[PDB]
Design a protein around this motif. Sequence first.
Motif, PDB file in Angstrom:
ATOM      1  N   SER A 181     -32.403  70.010  83.535  1.00  0.00           N
ATOM      2  CA  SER A 181     -33.741  69.290  83.983  1.00  0.00           C
ATOM      3  C   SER A 181     -34.116  69.665  85.257  1.00  0.00           C
ATOM      4  N   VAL A 182     -33.332  69.601  86.367  1.00  0.00           N
ATOM      5  CA  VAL A 182     -33.657  69.812  87.763  1.00  0.00           C
ATOM      6  C   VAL A 182     -32.863  71.037  88.137  1.00  0.00           C
ATOM      7  N   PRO A 183     -33.146  72.060  88.797  1.00  0.00           N
ATOM      8  CA  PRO A 183     -32.546  73.248  89.146  1.00  0.00           C
ATOM      9  C   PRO A 183     -31.432  72.687  90.162  1.00  0.00           C
ATOM     10  N   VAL A 184     -29.918  73.436  90.104  1.00  0.00           N
ATOM     11  CA  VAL A 184     -29.050  73.309  91.088  1.00  0.00           C
ATOM     12  C   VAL A 184     -29.608  73.409  92.434  1.00  0.00           C
ATOM     13  N   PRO A 185     -29.351  72.645  93.511  1.00  0.00           N
ATOM     14  CA  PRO A 185     -29.821  72.988  94.807  1.00  0.00           C
ATOM     15  C   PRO A 185     -29.493  74.413  95.120  1.00  0.00           C
ATOM     16  N   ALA A 186     -30.407  74.892  96.131  1.00  0.00           N
ATOM     17  CA  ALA A 186     -30.386  76.299  96.229  1.00  0.00           C
ATOM     18  C   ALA A 186     -29.428  76.536  97.318  1.00  0.00           C
ATOM     19  N   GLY A 187     -29.099  75.828  98.406  1.00  0.00           N
ATOM     20  CA  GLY A 187     -28.160  76.184  99.223  1.00  0.00           C
ATOM     21  C   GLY A 187     -26.658  75.390  98.915  1.00  0.00           C
ATOM     22  N   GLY A 188     -26.492  74.801  97.604  1.00  0.00           N
ATOM     23  CA  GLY A 188     -25.069  74.301  97.557  1.00  0.00           C
ATOM     24  C   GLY A 188     -24.526  75.165  96.789  1.00  0.00           C
ATOM     25  N   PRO A 189     -23.510  74.884  96.342  1.00  0.00           N
ATOM     26  CA  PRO A 189     -22.319  75.514  95.516  1.00  0.00           C
ATOM     27  C   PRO A 189     -22.876  75.635  94.250  1.00  0.00           C
TER      28      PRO A 189
END
Lengths: 48, 49
Positions: free
Chosen positions: A15-23
Amino acid sequence: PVDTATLWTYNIIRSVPVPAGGPSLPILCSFWDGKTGAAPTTDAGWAA
Amino acid sequence: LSKPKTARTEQSPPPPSPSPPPPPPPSPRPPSPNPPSPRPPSPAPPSPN
Ligand SMILES: *[C@@H]1O[C@H](CO)[C@H](O)[C@H](O)[C@H]1O
Ligand SMILES: *[C@H]1O[C@H](CO)[C@H](O)[C@H](O)[C@H]1O
Ligand SMILES: *[C@H]1O[C@H](CO)[C@H](O)[C@H](O)[C@H]1O
Ligand SMILES: *[C@H]1O[C@H](CO)[C@H](O)[C@H](O)[C@H]1O
Ligand SMILES: *[C@H]1O[C@H](CO)[C@H](O)[C@H](O)[C@H]1O
Ligand SMILES: *[C@H]1O[C@H](CO)[C@H](O)[C@H](O)[C@H]1O
Ligand SMILES: *[C@H]1O[C@H](CO)[C@H](O)[C@H](O)[C@H]1O
């Protein structure tokens, strides 16, 4: 026919994209083909 | 395609190894020197007679 392979392909959407900076979000897909034994009934069985 | 995806017997390759660390900050700098040592006293004039 009996005793041949077959390709089951699964596509998954979050539903929500994976955080851009995270793994990367690492997933383990546990699969029961629908013909062999009764499939795990708990998350422990799926994780095994 | 000739051999389907069910016949791909290869094994996947590992993830990218991590990226190296950054360089260090430039070192400080050796303590600067001291101001010239002060001259000595000055001999008083001839004693009277
Ligand atoms: C003393 O002189 C200058 C600064 O005073 C230099 O950067 C070094 O600290 C030292 O050589
Ligand atoms: C990992 O990569 C290989 C390709 O060499 C293969 O497609 C596997 O099925 C995949 O999981
Ligand atoms: C650097 O790490 C990756 C996987 O994280 C891989 O194992 C390489 O072999 C290693 O050098
Ligand atoms: C530095 O190195 C790794 C691979 O070794 C990766 O490309 C990173 O994106 C990079 O910052
Ligand atoms: C001088 O200091 C820097 C640190 O900023 C360096 O790591 C070494 O300690 C030395 O080259
Ligand atoms: C005498 O005292 C010092 C030396 O001891 C210096 O040369 C002065 O100029 C003089 O007065
Ligand atoms: C002459 O001068 C000297 C300096 O050392 C001293 O003051 C004596 O007392 C004087 O006679």
